[PDB]
Amino acid sequence: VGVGTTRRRPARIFRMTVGAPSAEVELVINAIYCQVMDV
Amino acid sequence: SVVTKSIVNADAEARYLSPGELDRIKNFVSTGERRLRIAQTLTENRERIVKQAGDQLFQKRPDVVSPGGNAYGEEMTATCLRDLDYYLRLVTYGIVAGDVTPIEEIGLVGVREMYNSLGTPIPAVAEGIRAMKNVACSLLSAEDAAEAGSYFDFVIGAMQ
Amino acid sequence: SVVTKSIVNADAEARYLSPGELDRIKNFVSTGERRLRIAQTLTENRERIVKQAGDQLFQKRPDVVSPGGNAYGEEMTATCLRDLDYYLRLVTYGIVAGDVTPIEEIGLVGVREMYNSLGTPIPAVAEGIRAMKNVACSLLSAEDAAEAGSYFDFVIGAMQ
Amino acid sequence: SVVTKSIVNADAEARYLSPGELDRIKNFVSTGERRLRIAQTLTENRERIVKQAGDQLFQKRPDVVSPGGNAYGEEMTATCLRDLDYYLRLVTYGIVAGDVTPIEEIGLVGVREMYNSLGTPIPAVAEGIRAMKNVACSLLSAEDAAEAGSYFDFVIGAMQ
Amino acid sequence: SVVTKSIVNADAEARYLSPGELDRIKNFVSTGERRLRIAQTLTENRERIVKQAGDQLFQKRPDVVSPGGNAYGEEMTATCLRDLDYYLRLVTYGIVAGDVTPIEEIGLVGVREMYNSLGTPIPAVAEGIRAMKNVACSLLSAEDAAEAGSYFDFVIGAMQ
Amino acid sequence: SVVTKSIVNADAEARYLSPGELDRIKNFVSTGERRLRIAQTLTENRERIVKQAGDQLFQKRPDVVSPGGNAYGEEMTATCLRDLDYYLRLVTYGIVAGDVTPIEEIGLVGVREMYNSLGTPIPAVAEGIRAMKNVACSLLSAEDAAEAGSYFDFVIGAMQ
Amino acid sequence: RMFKITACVPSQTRIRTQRELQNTYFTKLVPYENWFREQQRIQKMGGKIVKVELFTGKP
Amino acid sequence: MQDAITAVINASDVQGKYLDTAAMEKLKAYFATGELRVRAASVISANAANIVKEAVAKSLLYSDITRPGGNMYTTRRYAACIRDLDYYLRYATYAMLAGDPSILDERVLNGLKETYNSLGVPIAATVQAIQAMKEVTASLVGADAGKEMGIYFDYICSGLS
Amino acid sequence: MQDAITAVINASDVQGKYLDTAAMEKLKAYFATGELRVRAASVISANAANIVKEAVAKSLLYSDITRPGGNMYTTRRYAACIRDLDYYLRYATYAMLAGDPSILDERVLNGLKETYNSLGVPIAATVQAIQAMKEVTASLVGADAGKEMGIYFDYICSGLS
Amino acid sequence: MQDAITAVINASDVQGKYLDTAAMEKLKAYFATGELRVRAASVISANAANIVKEAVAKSLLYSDITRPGGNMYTTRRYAACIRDLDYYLRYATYAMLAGDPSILDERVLNGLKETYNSLGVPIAATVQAIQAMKEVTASLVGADAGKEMGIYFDYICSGLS
Amino acid sequence: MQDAITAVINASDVQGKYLDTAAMEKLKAYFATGELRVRAASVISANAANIVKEAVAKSLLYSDITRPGGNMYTTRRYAACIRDLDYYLRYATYAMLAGDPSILDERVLNGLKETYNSLGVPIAATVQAIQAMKEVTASLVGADAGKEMGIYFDYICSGLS
Amino acid sequence: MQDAITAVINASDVQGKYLDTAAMEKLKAYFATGELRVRAASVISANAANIVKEAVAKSLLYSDITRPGGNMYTTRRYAACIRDLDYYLRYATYAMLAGDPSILDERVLNGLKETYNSLGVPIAATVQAIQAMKEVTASLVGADAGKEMGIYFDYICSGLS
Ligand SMILES: CCC1=C(C)/C(=C/C2=NC(=C\c3[nH]c(/C=C4\NC(=O)[C@H](C)[C@H]4CC)c(C)c3CCC(=O)O)/C(CCC(=O)O)=C2C)NC1=O
Ligand SMILES: CCC1=C(C)/C(=C/C2=NC(=C\c3[nH]c(/C=C4\NC(=O)[C@H](C)[C@H]4CC)c(C)c3CCC(=O)O)/C(CCC(=O)O)=C2C)NC1=O
Ligand SMILES: CCC1=C(C)/C(=C/C2=NC(=C\c3[nH]c(/C=C4\NC(=O)[C@H](C)[C@H]4CC)c(C)c3CCC(=O)O)/C(CCC(=O)O)=C2C)NC1=O
Numbered sequence A: 001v002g003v004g005t006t007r008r009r010p011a012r013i014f015r016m017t018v019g020a021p022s023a024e025v026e027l028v029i030n031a032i033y034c035q036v037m038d039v
Numbered sequence B, C, D, E, F: 001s002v003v004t005k006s007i008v009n010a011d012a013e014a015r016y017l018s019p020g021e022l023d024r025i026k027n028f029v030s031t032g033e034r035r036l037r038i039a040q041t042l043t044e045n046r047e048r049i050v051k052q053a054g055d056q057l058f059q060k061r062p063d064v065v066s067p068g069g070n071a072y073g074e075e076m077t078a079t080c081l082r083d084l085d086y087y088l089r090l091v092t093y094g095i096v097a098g099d100v101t102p103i104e105e106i107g108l109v110g111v112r113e114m115y116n117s118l119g120t121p122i123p124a125v126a127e128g129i130r131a132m133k134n135v136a137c138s139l140l141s142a143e144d145a146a147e148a149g150s151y152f153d154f155v156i157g158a159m160q
Numbered sequence G: 001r002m003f004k005i006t007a008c009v010p011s012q013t014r015i016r017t018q019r020e021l022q023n024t025y026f027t028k029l030v031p032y033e034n035w036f037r038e039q040q041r042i043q044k045m046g047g048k049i050v051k052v053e054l055f056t057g058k059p
Numbered sequence H, I, J, K, L: 001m002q003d004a005i006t007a008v009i010n011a012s013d014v015q016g017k018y019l020d021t022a023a024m025e026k027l028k029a030y031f032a033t034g035e036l037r038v039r040a041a042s043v044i045s046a047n048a049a050n051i052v053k054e055a056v057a058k059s060l061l062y063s064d065i066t067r068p069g070g071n072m073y074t075t076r077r078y079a080a081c082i083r084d085l086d087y088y089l090r091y092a093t094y095a096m097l098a099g100d101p102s103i104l105d106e107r108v109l110n111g112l113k114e115t116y117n118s119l120g121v122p123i124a125a126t127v128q129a130i131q132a133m134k135e136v137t138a139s140l141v142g143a144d145a146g147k148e149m150g151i152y153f154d155y156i157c158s159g160l161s
């Protein structure tokens, strides 16, 4: 019985930060809605 | 591009490009000529594909093609076909790039708003994309058709 | 795996796997056999590879193994060889995986903190991995050395 | 300074310092003469302490002065002495302030990053700081050595 | 305690206790015997001081004692005096602790809301506290009165 | 205005004004004539109502008018009356507007702090406002008194 | 009514590995009530207030 | 932000006297006109999407701006262009209902011309399209409502400036 | 999350031994399955919306659940039901490609049953819908792909119930 | 921020030199005045509210600024006027006790002039109120304490400039 | 909040009584032993890194815990383990300075056992590591101070088990 | 951001026409250079610490900047200088992989001059250091990689303004 590396390893998440104007800006926008509001 | 997407992820992580990510870019370099050849074929047969797919789309959605639809009259149908041609050119650009992000910037952003402003039916646009996929399968090799079909499938989702 | 990294990106994007991402997964499927063969070679020559690497690392920085050094004494030198062997096994896992995902979760997250606590020199550990890279290139085929060298190089950069 | 830390707390509170906070200010005012006297001793014997501490550090960690160490050669060793002198003068400034905050602002923030990039061993630098503290204990009165030892120990902990 | 408040700040900053904070604790312990002697003197003379201060407060604010004031009638005046006595005991506890935190926990947190609910005049209560402070300063020895004055001044500021 | 407040809510929704909200605005348009006539009557009797309310307030709080009170002295009483009249004029403006929010923005925001700076009792100011409300109800018609009572109730809440 | 304020705060306490230039120098718009707390917070951080301007027409 | 009645109240507050009889007369006239304005505004809200489409057809349809590189020749650009026109219409509707264009100038026109100039969007061309939309909207709404629509369109012309 | 290759690597790390022959053939099984997996994933993405529509039509449409008071008898409720089904389908497609149920356990099936219970949405109704979606997906993907997709979807349905 | 000792240390750090006897004399002056400054600062804290009230009356007692249209002629405006002066007094008291004015300039003066210019509030009127506060604080605290309070108030006047 | 002196004050506050002789004696004892506690706490902070290194060497290292599959096999787990010991020591020394075991229960021991159980940390191994720290800390601090530190360390262990 | 392929796509989109044969030849040249660029980027990551060390030593070691009052005479400033230099090297390396400097200019060169002006750092001294780093990087990577790296570093030098 040996615990594998997945022993509370993956709780973290991708971090969304603003930047230069691109279509990815709406991905950041989506993230803001997705987290501040619980969609 | 594929390099653009991978570099975007790496820049967010603030890490130099990972070995696997670099390998992905190297694979893009290896298959660049084949991707360009497929794109050149699409551009070469662009007009014929447009005509055949237009006939199939009109058959699928007769009401739009007929008067009393969005493509009511020759002029309205021609404008609709011109918009479809712009879609096809964007699809060729995306297939050459290997990443659907350029196509998404060209057409996917606010696509629902544009279709609503025109009044035209989004499902019929999607059906036209499917007809283009069948024509592309006819005019491409089996390996080429699969990749082109994948990009076209992203286009179908964009139509929805 | 490379598929695992792509899945993580897709989950963040809240979208099905991109066509290009699936293409890289297909490339990983194709290269599974070659990667497994390279990993088998490393595992087969495991003892000699890290033995030569240990001699090279101790030659490059004799204070690791000298009196007053972190690994002074036979038992601590064997423990140093074990740490190198842990890294070698992780590199073999990563070569099979086709991505940095296996190594990053084991030996590339917080490794600086752990080594600082015990007292072992991080720069000397990095040099030891470099010595392993040279030995592996000697013991592998030219393009096998390139891929294995890439995974090794990510490990070395992580130590920095 | 003690006044500076009190000012920070007061800035957040937007309220006048409580009687206990004022008592802390009064204690610093009462011991200002003691702090100046201790600083007088340290500054007067500063150069001798630096040279003695250099001898002690080289004895305890000869690897630093050994071939391949950072302080190999007269120029590098002189740079080591200058760095130790900068730390000692910073300690004197902090002792005069009465709080480790002035020393922390001047240095020891990012010191790990800077020294590790330079290539000198952080543990060896910490050992030199410890030798300086021992020399100060020998050269100063016990009551002054208590305060001076405390500020020295804060520097040692930051180095760790 | 003052040491307790410093420990709270240190825990929030996620750092071991600062040398200055430790010095604050040492000074408080050294002065603790005098602090408790002053506190015991205040407790011993608490009743007489309470009576004198109550007379002075009524003289300064006759309307409050008179009908149409919060302390209208003997019973209302008695409840007013009881609240003052509880505040005096809390002030003694704060002086003994060497920090205003014990007094702040007991009262002055939401005290304005309590006064608004009851209708009792906050400025008159503050003046009564000031009268008690003057009488207590006269009653205590000069060194003890100096500390007691600071604690009482903090209470007066909370009242205002 | 009430329509303006509804417009602000509609702007936050980023949608055109709600059907019920527009109907309420139309009702306000009809009610404007009654509001104007009632306001004209209130303005005509404003001075007399102010004098009567001042006498009632002096009866309620003789101590405030007397020495040792906020209105002690002719000058202090005159400033008190000016504040009461300014609040009455603001109340008339708010009633004419039909929006309690405009009156709250102009005054009664932080009014407790303003009264604290002046030294006047908020409860005594409230009692004066209540006397003015009773006089205004008598001066106005029964329908006008009902609206005036609502505005006075908002003023009473601000006073408390 | 809101104010367009631009201020630059040095990140002395945390030498952030992730890109922090945007946070180091920024231009933002804050409500008039928000401006009191935001100016105090920027002062607490120690950043210099490059500019204060009023987007609203009337002072 | 200021209502029409609130603006009269603000003037009286600055004066330090109760609202004048002439100001009260202006408020009463505003209420009387507001009833008709409100009915027309409800009509405008119901046909807002149709009005936007008509203006876009009048100018944007079959235009060089629609042709590639015309600053509206993208899916994102087209969505933004239509959205900006609709937002201008909504803010103008609020201004017409209030009787004061101060709110529209305060938020919608606050640096909008400068931002559009930085973006490169043609402010004058958009203003011409907005004027055509204003004419059509005024015709549908009526003459009295067209007068209010004219005030909102004048604010739009100032925004073009 | 985990993959087939990643899970074998985890097991080897637990054991503390370099790649064995057993490890080699487990990994090789994943390598062989990759072609089937990726082809099926492309098909699933292409017909994803149609899959949801077919599943609810086969199971919950034209039923009391759709009729008033059935937890799906609102526009918002119906949209939410379709959304949750799409969430399960997307994570299941991920997990099918990955080869391991760790993704479904970590994200899809975390607290879902308790939240569904407190809301009052029927776990049994969701399970029936998931099985219907599995049937539609197997038909679209193909026989070999349907077997794997069945395993992953089975994990989601079993965890929900 | 800075203190007297901290400012001397900053100058010494820029110089790079060991502690100087002249710097020790300056620090000794700070230590010698610190005890009296601490007692005076406690007095200022005790009577802070009364000092603010007296200064507010001196500058604004039946003032035209209080009268309608005077920019302090609102409940919110009057409260804000009180609040700013109170904050300035507290920060100035801390600066006077510290013996260094740089912290006061950075925390309070930085951006204050720009904000006051945008608001349109009269800097000179605030400076007159600040001078009245300095006079009242000097009277309550004493002449020796008033000298330190005067230095802090002079820095406040410079910030108004 | 709870400290030794503060807890005596809090009990007296609940009674409402003025300071008793017994309360004065207990507070005097806290004042009396503060000197030894303070000096030892400074020593602990100075040699904190060496203490956790010694503790893991004496208890948690060169065993199955750090060998594969032992919950420390990976660098992430090892870093968290030494970090956890460091936090244990830091809050323990906080509490040792305070003199009251209540502080550690408020922060260190609030849900700690449940968290460790959920993550799979060996409770016994953590307890033995804490005991090893107790030996090392006693050696550095000295017997008189270490005995006081040992009581609060042991309270942490009791909370864990 | 932007890449070489993305730039070709942007030109084609502005044209509104399918890719020309000459444009395709430009894309083919990018594909040809990609292999060397990718290997060079991997080499840069492996020797990144060595590159930073050598460049920093050549630029400012044993200099007035290191000496007291030289603005790199604090440990925090020294670390921050290394951090800024490493960020410059890394972002430029990613741009070198892309083959297009637009991403580097947008991400790193926007507002950098204003921020450095506020910081007081010598942009010209940083430019000399970056040029020295370009020389060292060219030496380590090789001639072909050095030429592209030099062009990107020249773009960084232009952004230093
Ligand atoms: C680069 C991305 C992009 C696209 C794609 C785009 C499309 C686009 N489609 C338009 C209209 C239109 N689009 C359609 C579309 C259709 N009607 C049908 O019956 C079919 C189902 C369907 C296509 C097969 C029609 C009919 C119009 C004219 C609207 C009308 O006048 O009734 C117009 C307005 C007229 C014009 O071109 O000036 C644009 C700009 N604009 C863009 O910037
Ligand atoms: C309480 C709110 C609420 C609504 C409104 C609602 C509507 C609703 N409409 C449905 C079907 C449908 N709705 C339509 C609608 C139309 N087809 C047309 O040609 C017209 C343009 C249009 C109506 C005028 C059609 C055709 C179906 C059947 C779809 C099918 O199964 O093929 C269904 C699925 C079948 C079912 O009931 O199980 C629902 C749930 N459900 C709700 O909970
Ligand atoms: C871990 C991933 C995850 C899950 C599983 C999840 C489920 C989830 N489902 C919810 C509600 C809901 N879910 C349904 C779904 C259904 N209606 C039906 O008829 C079917 C039997 C069924 C599925 C097909 C409905 C109707 C609601 C309530 C919607 C409402 O009335 O507001 C809610 C409450 C918030 C809301 O209303 O959306 C959550 C959080 N959220 C998550 O983040």
Ligand SMILES: CCC1=C(C)/C(=C/C2=NC(=C\c3[nH]c(/C=C4\NC(=O)[C@H](C)[C@H]4CC)c(C)c3CCC(=O)O)/C(CCC(=O)O)=C2C)NC1=O
Pocket (backbone or CB within 6 Å): F057, F061, F064, F065, F069, F070, F071, F076, F077, F079, F080, F081, F083, F084, F086, F087, F090, F106, F107, F108, F114, F118, F119, F120, F121, F124, F125, F128, J060, J061, J062, J063, J066, J072, J073, J074, J075, J078
């Ligand atoms: C337009 C909104 C508005 C209001 C209302 C307002 C009130 C206001 N009331 C004041 C004073 C005062 N207010 C009172 C009030 C009272 N004393 C009593 O005994 C009564 C219970 C009560 C009145 C019914 C008194 C006595 C003063 C003078 C106090 C002094 O300054 O010495 C002052 C200070 C002196 C001055 O005017 O400069 C202001 C500004 N300011 C405003 O901008």
Ligand SMILES: CCC1=C(C)/C(=C/C2=NC(=C\c3[nH]c(/C=C4\NC(=O)[C@H](C)[C@H]4CC)c(C)c3CCC(=O)O)/C(CCC(=O)O)=C2C)NC1=O
Pocket (backbone or CB within 6 Å): G032, G033, G035, G036, G039, G040, G043, G059, J065, J070, J071, J072, J076, J077, J078, J080, J081, J082, J084, J085, J087, J088, J107, J108, J112, J115, J119, J121, J122, J125, J126, J129
């Ligand atoms: C670090 C301490 C600090 C300062 C100094 C500061 C300045 C400051 N003063 C303000 C407002 C204000 N300040 C005043 C002050 C005055 N009006 C007068 O007639 C007098 C001459 C004068 C007082 C002596 C007024 C009236 C406002 C409100 C402006 C308005 O809306 O009309 C505001 C706007 C936000 C608010 O309502 O607080 C700021 C930010 N902010 C701060 O955090």
Ligand SMILES: CCC1=C(C)/C(=C/C2=NC(=C\c3[nH]c(/C=C4\NC(=O)[C@H](C)[C@H]4CC)c(C)c3CCC(=O)O)/C(CCC(=O)O)=C2C)NC1=O
Pocket (backbone or CB within 6 Å): C063, C064, C065, C069, C070, C071, C072, C076, C077, C079, C080, C081, C083, C084, C086, C087, C106, C107, C118, C120, C121, C124, C125, C128, K060, K061, K062, K063, K066, K072, K073, K074, K075, K078
């Ligand atoms: C999966 C990630 C991972 C790794 C790699 C790992 C290694 C590891 N190396 C250790 C020790 C050590 N590591 C070294 C390392 C070195 N000394 C030198 O001179 C060289 C420069 C260098 C290696 C080449 C030494 C000397 C020790 C023993 C320390 C001692 O007991 O004095 C220890 C502590 C003793 C023990 O095994 O209990 C661990 C856990 N643990 C992990 O969880």
Ligand SMILES: CCC1=C(C)/C(=C/C2=NC(=C\c3[nH]c(/C=C4\NC(=O)[C@H](C)[C@H]4CC)c(C)c3CCC(=O)O)/C(CCC(=O)O)=C2C)NC1=O
Pocket (backbone or CB within 6 Å): D064, D065, D069, D070, D071, D076, D077, D079, D080, D081, D083, D084, D086, D087, D106, D107, D118, D120, D121, D124, D125, D128, L060, L061, L062, L063, L066, L067, L072, L073, L074, L075, L078
């Ligand atoms: C005011 C705070 C502060 C400090 C402390 C500081 C340190 C500092 N140490 C340096 C170098 C150095 N530091 C060391 C340090 C050591 N080598 C050893 O063997 C010992 C263990 C140890 C000292 C006891 C060495 C050897 C160098 C020279 C590196 C080289 O030239 O290759 C340098 C670069 C050369 C120069 O001074 O120009 C700086 C700036 N800078 C600062 O602003």
Ligand SMILES: CCC1=C(C)/C(=C/C2=NC(=C\c3[nH]c(/C=C4\NC(=O)[C@H](C)[C@H]4CC)c(C)c3CCC(=O)O)/C(CCC(=O)O)=C2C)NC1=O
Pocket (backbone or CB within 6 Å): G010, G011, G012, G014, G015, G016, G018, G019, G020, G021, G022, G024, L065, L070, L071, L072, L077, L078, L080, L081, L082, L084, L085, L087, L088, L091, L107, L108, L112, L115, L119, L121, L122, L125, L126, L129
């Ligand atoms: C997108 C990549 C990126 C860059 C380039 C960047 C620049 C940058 N450099 C900074 C600091 C700094 N940069 C330096 C740099 C130098 N001092 C010297 O003597 C040298 C000539 C030079 C280095 C070559 C210094 C000293 C500071 C600290 C200034 C301070 O707050 O005191 C800061 C302030 C915040 C911080 O501490 O990080 C930024 C934002 N930020 C970024 O996100």
